[PDB]
Amino acid sequence: HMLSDEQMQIINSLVEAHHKTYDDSYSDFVRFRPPVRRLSMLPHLADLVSYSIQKVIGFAKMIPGFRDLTAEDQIALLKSSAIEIIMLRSNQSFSLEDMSWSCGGPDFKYCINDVTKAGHTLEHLEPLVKFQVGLKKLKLHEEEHVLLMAICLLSPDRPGVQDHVRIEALQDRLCDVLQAYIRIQHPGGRLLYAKMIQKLADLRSLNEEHSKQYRSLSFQPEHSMQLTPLVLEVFGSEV
Amino acid sequence: HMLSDEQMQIINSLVEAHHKTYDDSYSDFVRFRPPVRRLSMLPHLADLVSYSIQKVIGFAKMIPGFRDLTAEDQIALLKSSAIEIIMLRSNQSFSLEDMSWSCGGPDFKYCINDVTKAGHTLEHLEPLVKFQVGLKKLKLHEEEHVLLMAICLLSPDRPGVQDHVRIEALQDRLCDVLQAYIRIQHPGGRLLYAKMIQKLADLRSLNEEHSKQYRSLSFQPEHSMQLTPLVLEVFGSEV
């Protein structure tokens, strides 16, 4: 009926974690290869995605008990979740007012069209935008935003995971915190937790559609060369 | 005592080749990750080097009878020569007035210091600058500049070459053209050809010192990740 002590400790860690790995000014986007409006956005977007991965890794390392997993599983989880964790955190810059990620502009205002000039079809971009709007409409306290990413990341059924027992464990502990937080700290959170867990499955689907169109993109050398070593590594098949 | 017909044809091809693969305005340097004055120049310089490789490949493909080699040897030659071909072509932007490559500025004016902020020691940069000044003092007609790169590239003793007989052949044919050109078209070219061939061996040495400090640079993942797929591929060990 009230939040635990080991539960505040966890929430504090996760919010600080996200605070140190997400910039609301986006003041590193200048260091990326410029955006261009072939696949003119690919260089820029690949630089953006590569950058984000490094941040996700920063965040992940600060999720409680994550450093305690085997290096192998840590990799298995990053590799599988990475992309979803990004769609998640990107919502923070998504804008329903104009339906586009605004990290600046007109340079850094990414719309569905841009991601097209990077090798993706509208027939597959549509659901990602839909996912963004629904997520944005949930008006999440940052506590929930953070727990959601930390839970999404610890999702037990990732291809390549070994100790799926302890992973469902640290994710269950997190879910407790979330359900407790909404009930206790969120006025009118009756249906929220459910809606949130609903989002996770929207991600599995979005993740899939990506793996497909990225595979096709990564198999053309003229395109793969536009990527970064990290991207190639994280979305690669090596095991 | 006068230039052949099959010899003008060759010179024409090589000059057009260099004309279509080298830009005197350097108007693509804006598309690179910005330069920064750790290893702040590495991102920019890696983008510059990657760009240059693609150009060298463009040039190489237009060298006469190069398309007639096996895909394997073409690779073996690019991999070994690439770096030297770059030091060669860079001279065109090097400036004795200020001893630095000026492709713009203050942004694109690269000095010895910059290449330091990219993972190389002065105790090894010194000879490259020396090589640039000597080369610049030879005041080469572009015909000679081009033949020099086309000869350097066809250098027969590259690690990994198979048909070293036909390669010494197409390079001998080129050398004829060069010696003929200087004697016939260059007033006071008595000692030139020799000085030029002298430069090639300066390159083998500069090439070596690079392979060493790049190996050390490429073995640190925090650094290799700053590179490009092409660089990694071209300076890699795969066979």
Binding site: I57, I75, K79, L230, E233, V239 | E222
Partner: peptide, 10 residues
């Protein structure tokens, strides 16, 4: 395999 990731995970 996974040179960079290992490194990034201190």
């Amino acid at each position: 395999k996974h040179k960079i990731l290992h490194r990034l995970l201190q």
